C-alpha cells in the first residue's frame, strides 16, 4: 500500500476532506444556526430532528442496497455531489425561510435534504471510500483522516465570521462541492460473488448481525445522544460562557487534529490487535468519558473528557469496518454498514434521546450522564464476549 | 420550566453590606449556569457575576469586582449575591438569571436594592 503518489488516495483523501468540511457547516453548529439566525422554538426542534430521523431511517437501508449492488460503480456519489452543490441555497434560501413560515413543512424539506446528504449520505460516502481503499492499495482510515481536517476547517472559518457574514460559509461549502464533483471526475474506478438482494435480506437471519447491532443500540447510539446535549454541560462549567464556548471552539477545532493523528496509525494499530478489540477500545473511551462526566466537576475536566472523543473515533470507524469486513461477506460491506450502525443506531435514538432528554429534566445531568454510562459500559462488557473474534485477553 | 424568585433585597445606607438569595423551582438547578443582573433607572442593565453550576468558575465585573461574592447551594436549590461595602451607585433592580448556552433563558422578577447616601 502506497499513499504519496497514490493518485486515489488522493481524490478520495481529498474528497473526505471537502465533503467532512461541507457537513462541518450543516452539523456540530446546528443548534446554534437554528436558535440563533433564524430564532426558532426548541419546542421545534424535536420536530426536525424527527423529520430527519424518519426521512434518515428511510434513505440509508436504500443507500446501503444501492451501494452494493452498485458495487464501485460510484453513480449514487456522482447523485450526493449534486445535491451539495446546493448547500448554501438550500439554507439560505429554502430552509431557513420554510421553516419561519411553517415549520412542519421546512422540517419535510429539510429533513428529505438533509437525511438524504448527510445522515445517510456521509455513511454512504464513507462506505464506498473503504471499497475504493481495498481496489487501490490504500488504508481506509489513511483516507478517512482528511475528513477530520475538513471538519476542523470549517468548524475555525465559521467561528471567525460568525460575528461577520453567517452566510459565507454555506457559500464556500457549495463550492466545495464542485470541488468534489472535480475529484470524483478524475478518480479512477454470472458473478455470484456480486451483490444480490435476495441473500441480502437473509442477513438478518445471522445472529452476529443481531450481536453488533446490539453493540450499536446499546454503545455507539447511547454515546452518540449523550454527545447531543454534552455541548450545553459542557459551557456550564463556565462562568463567562463566553469563554466557555470559546474554550469549546478551540477544543473541537485542535482537538480534530488529534483525532486525525490517532486515526493516521489506528489502521496499523488495528490490524495486530483484533477489529473486535478496536471496537471494545472504543466502547471503553465511550464509556469513560460518560462516566467521567458525571463525577466532573471542573471547567478542565470537561476539556479532559470532550478530548476524548478524540480517542475514541479513530477505532470506532476504523474497526468497524475492519470488522465488517473480517466477519461478513465483504460484498455486503455497505449493506452492513448502513442497516447496522446508521439505521439501527438511528431507530434507537429515536427512543433513547427522548429517554435522555427526560432524565436531564428529572435528574440532573450528573445523573443523567451515570445512568447512560452504565447502559453503555454495560453492553460494551457483553460484547466482549458477544462479538465476534480474538478478544482482549489473546494479548496477555 | 424554571422559576427563579429573587429575594433578600431592600434599602441600606452607604457602606453597608446585604445579601440576596434566589429559590431555583423547576428543572434541576445544578444543571445550569447562573448570573446576577442589575438595571439601575437611566441606565442599561450590566451583568454583576456569574457562576458555573459546581461553583469552580466565578466571574464578576470590575465595577464590583471586590466587594461582591457569588454563592451556590445545589442542594438547597439557591443562589446568593452577598454585597458588601455597599455605595449609593449600586443602587438598581438585581435580578436573577439561569444560563443555558450563551444566553441567559430564565428570569426572575427581580429585587429592588436602594442605597443612601
Known amino acids: 500500500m502506497y499513499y504519496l503518489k497514490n493518485t486515489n488516495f488522493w481524490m478520495f483523501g481529498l474528497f473526505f476532506f471537502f465533503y467532512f468540511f461541507i457537513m462541518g457547516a450543516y452539523f456540530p453548529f446546528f443548534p446554534i444556526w437554528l436558535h440563533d439566525i433564524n430564532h426558532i422554538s426548541k419546542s421545534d426542534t424535536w420536530i426536525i430532528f424527527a423529520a430527519i430521523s424518519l426521512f434518515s431511517l428511510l434513505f440509508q437501508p436504500l443507500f446501503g442496497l444501492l451501494s452494493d449492488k452498485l458495487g464501485l460503480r460510484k453513480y449514487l456519489l456522482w447523485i450526493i455531489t449534486g445535491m451539495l452543490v446546493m448547500f448554501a441555497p438550500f439554507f439560505i434560501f429554502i430552509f431557513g425561510p420554510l421553516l419561519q413560515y411553517n415549520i412542519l413543512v421546512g422540517s419535510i424539506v429539510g429533513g428529505i435534504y438533509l437525511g438524504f446528504c448527510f445522515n445517510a449520505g456521509a455513511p454512504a460516502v464513507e462506505a464506498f471510500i473503504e471499497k475504493v481503499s481495498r481496489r487501490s492499495n490504500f488504508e481506509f482510515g489513511r483516507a478517512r483522516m482528511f475528513g477530520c481536517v475538513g471538519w476542523a476547517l470549517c468548524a475555525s472559518i465559521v467561528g471567525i465570521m460568525f460575528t461577520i457574514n453567517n452566510q459565507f460559509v454555506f457559500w464556500l461549502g457549495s463550492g466545495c462541492a464542485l470541488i468534489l464533483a472535480v475529484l470524483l471526475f478524475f478518480a479512477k474506478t454470472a458473478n455470484h460473488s456480486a451483490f444480490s438482494l435476495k441473500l441480502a435480506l437473509e442477513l438478518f437471519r445471522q445472529p452476529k448481525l443481531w450481536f453488533l447491532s446490539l453493540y450499536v443500540i446499546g454503545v455507539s447510539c447511547t454515546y452518540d445522544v449523550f454527545d447531543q446535549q454534552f455541548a450545553n454541560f459542557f459551557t456550564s462549567f463556565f462562568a463567562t460562557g463566553e469563554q466557555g464556548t470559546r474554550v469549546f471552539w478551540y477544543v473541537t477545532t485542535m482537538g480534530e487534529l488529534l483525532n486525525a493523528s490517532i486515526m493516521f496509525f489506528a489502521p496499523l494499530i488495528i490490524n495486530r490487535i483484533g477489529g473486535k478489540n478496536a471496537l471494545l477500545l472504543a466502547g471503553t473511551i465511550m464509556s469513560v468519558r460518560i462516566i467521567g462526566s458525571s463525577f466532573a466537576t471542573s471547567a478542565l475536566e470537561v476539556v479532559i473528557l470532550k478530548t476524548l472523543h478524540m480517542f475514541e473515533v479513530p477505532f470506532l470507524l476504523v474497526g468497524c469496518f475492519k470488522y465488517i469486513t473480517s466477519q461478513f461477506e465483504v460484498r455486503f460491506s455497505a449493506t452492513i454498514y448502513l442497516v447496522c450502525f446508521c439505521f439501527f443506531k438511528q431507530l434507537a435514538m429515536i427512543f433513547m434521546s427522548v429517554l435522555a432528554g427526560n432524565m436531564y429534566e428529572s435528574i440532573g445531568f450528573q445523573g443523567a450522564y451515570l445512568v447512560l454510562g452504565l447502559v453503555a459500559l454495560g453492553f460494551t462488557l457483553i460484547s466482549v464476549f458477544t462479538l465476534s473474534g480474538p478478544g482482549p485477553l489473546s494479548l496477555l | 420550566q424554571v422559576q427563579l424568585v429573587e429575594s433578600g433585597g431592600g434599602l441600606v445606607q452607604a457602606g453597608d453590606s446585604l445579601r440576596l438569595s434566589c429559590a431555583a423551582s423547576?428543572?434541576?438547578?445544578?444543571?445550569?449556569?447562573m448570573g446576577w443582573f442589575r438595571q439601575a433607572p437611566g441606565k442599561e442593565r450590566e451583568r454583576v457575576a456569574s457562576?458555573?453550576?459546581?461553583?469552580?468558575?466565578?466571574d464578576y465585573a470590575d465595577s464590583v469586582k471586590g466587594r461582591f461574592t457569588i454563592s451556590r447551594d445545589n442542594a438547597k436549590r439557591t443562589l446568593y449575591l452577598q454585597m458588601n461595602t455597599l455605595k449609593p451607585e449600586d443602587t438598581a433592580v438585581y435580578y436573577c438569571?439561569?444560563?443555558?448556552?450563551?444566553?441567559?433563558?430564565?428570569w426572575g422578577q427581580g429585587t429592588q436594592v436602594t442605597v443612601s447616601s
Open positions: 457562576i458555573n453550576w459546581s461553583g469552580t468558575d466565578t
Open positions: 423547576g428543572r434541576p438547578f445544578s444543571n445550569y449556569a
Open positions: 438569571a439561569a444560563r443555558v448556552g450563551v444566553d441567559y433563558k430564565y
